[PDB]
Amino acid sequence: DEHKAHKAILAYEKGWLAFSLAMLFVFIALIAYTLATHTAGVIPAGKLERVDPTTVRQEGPWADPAQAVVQTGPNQYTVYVLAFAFGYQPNPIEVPQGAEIVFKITSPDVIHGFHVEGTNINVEVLPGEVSTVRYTFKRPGEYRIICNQYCGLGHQNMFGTIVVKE
Amino acid sequence: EEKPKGALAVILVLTLTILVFWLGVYAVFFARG
Amino acid sequence: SRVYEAYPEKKATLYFLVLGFLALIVGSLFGPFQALNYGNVDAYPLLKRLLPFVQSYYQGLTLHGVLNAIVFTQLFAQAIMVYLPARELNMRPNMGLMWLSWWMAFIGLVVAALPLLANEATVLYTFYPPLKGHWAFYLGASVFVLSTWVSIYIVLDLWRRWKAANPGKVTPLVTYMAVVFWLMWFLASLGLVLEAVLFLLPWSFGLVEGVDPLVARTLFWWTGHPIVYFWLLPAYAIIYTILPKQAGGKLVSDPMARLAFLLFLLLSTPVGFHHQFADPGIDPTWKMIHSVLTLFVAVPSLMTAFTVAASLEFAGRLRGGRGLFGWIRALPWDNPAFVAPVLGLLGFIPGGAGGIVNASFTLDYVVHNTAWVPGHFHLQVASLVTLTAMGSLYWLLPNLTGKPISDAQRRLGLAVVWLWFLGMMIMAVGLHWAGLLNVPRRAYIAQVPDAYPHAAVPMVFNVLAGIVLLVALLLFIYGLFSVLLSRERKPELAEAPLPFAEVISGPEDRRLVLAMDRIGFWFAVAAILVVLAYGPTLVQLFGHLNPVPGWRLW
Ligand code: HAS
Ligand code: HEM
Ligand code: CUA
Ligand SMILES: [Cu+2]
Ligand SMILES: [Xe]
Ligand SMILES: [Xe]
Ligand SMILES: [Xe]
Ligand SMILES: [Xe]
């Protein structure tokens, strides 16, 4: 008793910790796997791509929203998206299935969120930085973009749209 | 006295909680993948 | 007062707690109104009539955020991790410095609370640029955080002075926790200070017309994650070194308590990138590194789960613990000082699982910035940290003032604690549910009623929670003020000793414990972990600065 209890607990504690680690190493394993598959695309590009937020819609890819979509490989299409105070450009974004869409998103004003309901596309948008994510929607229909970072009094109201074709 | 049977009970509940959450969330990611 | 002249440390502690719980009350009132918001009911015109100064939902959210997560907790840590080490060592803190740290917190608080109350700083508690608040929001918050830096100095002084009197002896348990706490915290606060000195402060004075958003939020989450452990460890100090006494048992292993706090000094700071899993301009491999280190920082909490559990079973058995679950009924569920942290520790169980999910990198994208995130940390900061704080009123507050606790008050708090807990569990299921259904957080969603129709059933929970917790909150305000308004005083329980918990010790302790008291070495290890995890990334951002002008969107 008491000295019997001290020994018994530190015994089951050495095991518990060996089990927790081995269970954590499984968790490290399964993450590694998702970094190896198609699904790993939604992780932002590593490289810095600097932009001026005050020139963005005057000169450059984001100025003309009729120019936002641009095929760039065999099954590739680049969409230059623009998340501004309470709205998304272009509205709507139109895209084809089986195609790998590479988004390039930026803001002229404040930090906005970009979250495409029913997808893993969940990336922050920072003025002065292009956020580059990849995704091939398999499901077709009506995609709704949501701002999920406080950006002003009309934040709760900033919805966007991705339009995907059969 | 003996084996901290009750403590093993509490950490197991915690082991099941982490597994239902994590593996549960590992489902929706691929179903959104 | 005599009590106040030989222990003036008691009075200084109370002025830290009063100011801390007052900030809890003023901050918490926005909660119920926010809980209903996610239940799709719009309660705010009512609140605009009650409180005329409130302009928007998000000024309410900034107040809820800052006054609870920043002001309440930081004034609780400052109260606990100075006084407790002082009561074990039976030594006086350099008093001139202790009051200079309290007034800093108070002058720092008043100066910053005005721009918030005047709606010149609707920016939330994370204040991400380019959303530019009023200059007096930044200056005031600076002085507020820089206050802890004087506290660090005080506890390190108490430590230096104890070592001086007992050369070669091992650091006493509580002081050890206190000491590795404020060291870690000093390593942590460097990311915030550098954001403050380099960008935020010159910005709001106009000296500079811009701020890089990527460095501003990279440096933020430098401090941004350890400061949640700056909240937790004050409650952890109270669960390790005081709860096993309140339950009728002992602390089962001292060296396990020291190793839990040692790992928190190591793996506290260099994990910030788990918050920036969805940010651009950060090499994907840097994140996979910080994902693994965060899973490692789960270990300290995993150990605590077993160390405390065996101590409570040890307590329950001593009170007459029966079969496998018999010890549970044997505990003292009549004492709010015991009931409060335990319940919190139950709710902590779903809290940690949610946490380990968010750390898994790619799985973060599923839940990021949805209602799930608040569902996670409310089971953490708003449950375990605050419940511990509430319970702790029932012993600490007698020990500071000398005013006793009636049987009416003892029962009133039990309900408060059962509701608060029952209210936080209902909410948790509510937000986790809606968060998996894509409901974004930080949004006046009631004002767009037709936006989230598939969240019908969790919206029920959110509505239910807001009612129960409003009731819980009011009862607490009522229970607290009665204790602080009675002229009942026994100057002898103002001089009674703190109910620390005695420790079971073995032979295998010595050589272990002795290695962990090599503080100066582990502090250097912790710092090189930061340079290795942050230095490579920060240097690349510094070479390519890209400031963008300020905005105000409220
Ligand atoms: C004080 C509050 C804090 C707790 C502690 C907490 C937990 C975790 N968190 Fe967290 N957190 C993250 C990493 C973790 C991890 C690994 C756990 C660990 O610290 C905790 C591991 C827990 C355990 C392993 C469980 C231990 C259980 C115990 C010890 C109880 C046992 C019970 C007993 C013994 C009872 C017996 C009783 C009887 C009656 C039998 C990440 C990413 O990895 C995100 C980002 C989400 C996103 O994308 O925005 C995040 C989101 C947040 C936010 C929102 C920030 C914002 O505004 O942007 C805050 C404030 C916060 C803090 C807190 N967080 N967290
Ligand atoms: C009175 C009981 C409480 C209720 C009903 C409540 C409810 C809520 C809800 C529903 C939100 C989400 C609002 C949104 O994202 O738009 C929220 C935010 C938050 N709560 Fe509470 N809460 C309570 C008390 C507390 C306490 C005691 C703390 C800290 C100890 C706390 C910390 C926070 C923080 C840090 C946020 C997010 C701040 C931000 O993103 O700007 N809450 N609360
Ligand atoms: Cu854009 Cu909130
Ligand atoms: Cu964190
Ligand atoms: Xe503050
Ligand atoms: Xe600061
Ligand atoms: Xe600050
Ligand atoms: Xe934070």
CATH of the domain at C323: 1.20.210.10
Burial of A137 (0-12, 13-18, 19+ CB in 10 A): buried
End-to-end Cα separation, chain B, in angstroms: 52
d(CA C300, CA C425): 24
Assess whether A65 and A117 both reside in one domain: yes
Domain match, A6 and A29 both: yes
Residue A55 and residue A75 in one domain:
yes
SS (H, E, C) chain A: CCHHHHHHHHHHHHHHHHHHHHHHHHHHHHHHHHCCCHHHHHCCCCCCCECCCCCCCCCCCCCCCCCCEEECCCCEEEEEEEEECCEEECCCEEEECCCEEEEEEECCCCCEEEEECCCCCEEEECCCECEEEEECCCCCEEEEEECCCCCCCCHHHCEEEEEEEC
My answer on whether A57 and A98 are in the same domain is yes
C-alpha C549/C-alpha C554 separation (Å) is 16
Q: How many CB atoms lie within 10 A of CB C511?
A: 9
Say how many domains are in chain C: 1
**Structural domain that includes position A53:** 45-166
| Domain with C248 in it | 1-554
Q: What share of chain C is helix, strand, coil (3-state, %, to 5)?
A: 70, 0, 25
Residue B11: give the domain boundaries: 1-33
Q: Per the annotation, does C275 bind a ligand?
A: yes
β-bridge pairing C548-549 and A141-146: unpaired
A36 and A94 fall within a common domain: no
C229 carries a ligand binding annotation: yes
Indicate whether residue C68 lines ligand 1 (CB < 6 A): no
A63 in the same domain as A35: no
CA A81/CA A95 separation, integer angstroms? 13
Those residues whose C-beta lies under 8 Å from the C-beta of residue C326, and which sit 6 or more positions away, are C316, C320
Query: In sequence order, what are the beta bridge partners of A71?
Result: A77
Q: How many CA atoms lie within 13 A of C34 on its CB side?
A: 24
Å from A166 to nearest chain C CA? 24
Q: Is C235 in the pocket of ligand 1 (CB under 6 A)?
A: no
Closest ligand by atom to C272 CA: 4
Q: Which residue among B5, B22, B28 sits closest to C360, beta carbon to beta carbon?
A: B22
- DSSP classification of residue C363: G
**Total count of domains within chain A:** 2
Residue B3 to residue C250: CA distance in whole angstroms: 16
Domain count, chain B: 1
> How many Cα atoms sit within 13 Å of C242 on the Cβ side?
28
- Suggest the residue from A14, A21, A43 to mutate for an interface test with chain C (most C CBs closer than 10 A): A43
* Ligand 3 atom at minimum distance from A86 CA: 1
CA torsion C456-C457-C459-C464 (nearest 10°) is: 140
Question: Are C278 and A122 within 8 A, CB to CB?
Answer: yes
**Number of neighbouring beta carbons within 10 Å of residue C184:** 25
Measured between alpha carbons, how far is A14 from C33 in angstroms, rounded to an integer? 47
Determination method here? X-ray
Whether the CB of B21 is below 8 Å from some CB of chain A: the reply is: no
- Does the beta-carbon distance from A16 to C306 stay under 8 Å? yes
Angle at C139 between CA C134 and CA C142, to 5 degrees: 130
Binding site membership of C381 for ligand 1 (Cβ less than 6 Å): yes
| Tokens coding C352 | 């940690």
Q: Is C481 exposed, middle or buried (0-12, 13-18, 19+ CB in 10 A)?
A: exposed
CA triple C521-C523-C528, angle to 5 deg:
95
Same domain? For A76 and A143 the reply is: yes
Give me ligand 3 centre to Cα C447, in Å: 15
Tell me the residue type at A103: F
Q: Which ligand is nearest to the CA of C112?
A: 5
CB contact (8 A) between residue A39 and residue C291 = no
Which residue among B11, B14, B21 sits closest to C354, beta carbon to beta carbon?
A: B21
Identify which of A31, A121, A126 has the shortest CB distance to residue C362.
Answer: A31
Nearest Cα residue to C279 out of A133, A91, A52, A2 = A133
C368 is known as an active-site residue: no
* Half-sphere exposure of residue C545: CA atoms within 13 angstroms, side-chain side: 8
Residues 6+ apart with CB under 8 A from C288: A31, A32, A35, C361
**How big is the A-C interface in CB pairs under 8 Å?**
200
**Separation between Cα atoms, residue A23 and residue A26, nearest integer Å:** 5
Q: How far is C298 from chain B (nearest CA, A)?
A: 11
User: β-strand A159-165 against A141-146: which pairing, if any?
Assistant: antiparallel
Ligand 8 centroid from CA C74, angstroms = 12
List of chain A residues whose C-beta atoms are within 8 Å of the C-beta of residue C282: 44, 46
Burial label, C228 (beta-carbon count in 10 A; 0-12, 13-18, 19+) = middle
